[PDB]
Amino acid sequence: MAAELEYESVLCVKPDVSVYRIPPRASNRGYRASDWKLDQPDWTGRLRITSKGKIAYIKLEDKVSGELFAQAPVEQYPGIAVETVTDSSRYFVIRIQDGTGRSAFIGIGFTDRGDAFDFNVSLQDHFKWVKQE
């Protein structure tokens, strides 16, 4: 049906997810959403991540069909740049890096925390081992 050979790949996906777009800038470490705010840059579509073997790459588009299509390749090493609302608001942000110099910052959230949780916790389940393999 699908299980035949195991490999190093998270296999994270999500047909229903929302993400924000903000200039790749940062003069510090601690974010400030409560003061940053954002209601314009926030496209909706499908987001997922995977890894061939020695490296990884995140693919995004639309679970339905989309159009443009894009992705963000990762070196599968400089894993970092992930945080949430320092002052507590109602969303979260995630970023990635590759080669130790190229990293993109974007926000991820949903009209509800319950759903946005299952999605986030899903990508992790595949990454680090805790609840399953």
Side-chain angles (χ1 to χ4, degrees):
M1 185 107 268
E4 243 247 335
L5 60 93
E6 312 245 279
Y7 241 49
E8 205 99 341
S9 174
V10 298
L11 89 112
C12 324
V13 303
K14 187 66 243 234
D16 269 79
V17 71
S18 317
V19 52
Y20 310 74
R21 211 304 304 260
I22 320 118
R25 301 243 105 278
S27 313
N28 248 301
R29 41 174 217 64
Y31 213 45
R32 270 196 158 219
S34 308
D35 281 284
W36 161 67
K37 205 81 81 165
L38 200 91
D39 287 19
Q40 184 244 305
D42 34 74
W43 39 287
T44 25
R46 186 240 269 261
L47 209 106
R48 58 228 233 274
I49 76 160
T50 21
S51 66
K52 302 146 97 308
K54 318 249 263 110
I55 49 78
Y57 59 97
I58 63 105
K59 274 206 255 149
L60 38 132
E61 35 133 45
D62 176 34
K63 178 71 140 165
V64 201
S65 240
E67 245 155 313
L68 290 143
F69 202 126
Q71 60 254 5
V74 318
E75 206 49 73
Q76 220 309 264
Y77 196 124
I80 27 66
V82 191
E83 265 292 356
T84 82
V85 286
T86 52
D87 240 45
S88 308
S89 320
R90 228 85 205 275
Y91 98 108
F92 51 99
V93 276
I94 182 273
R95 323 118 73 142
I96 319 161
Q97 180 180 124
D98 182 311
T100 321
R102 206 303 187 161
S103 6
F105 177 109
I106 57 140
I108 309 290
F110 235 54
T111 167
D112 294 282
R113 256 125 99 62
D115 263 346
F117 163 90
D118 303 272
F119 143 93
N120 257 328
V121 294
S122 229
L123 73 91
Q124 277 210 349
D125 201 276
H126 320 123
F127 194 87
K128 64 175 217 224
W129 316 307
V130 190
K131 241 139 116 87
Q132 275 235 99
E133 58 117 278

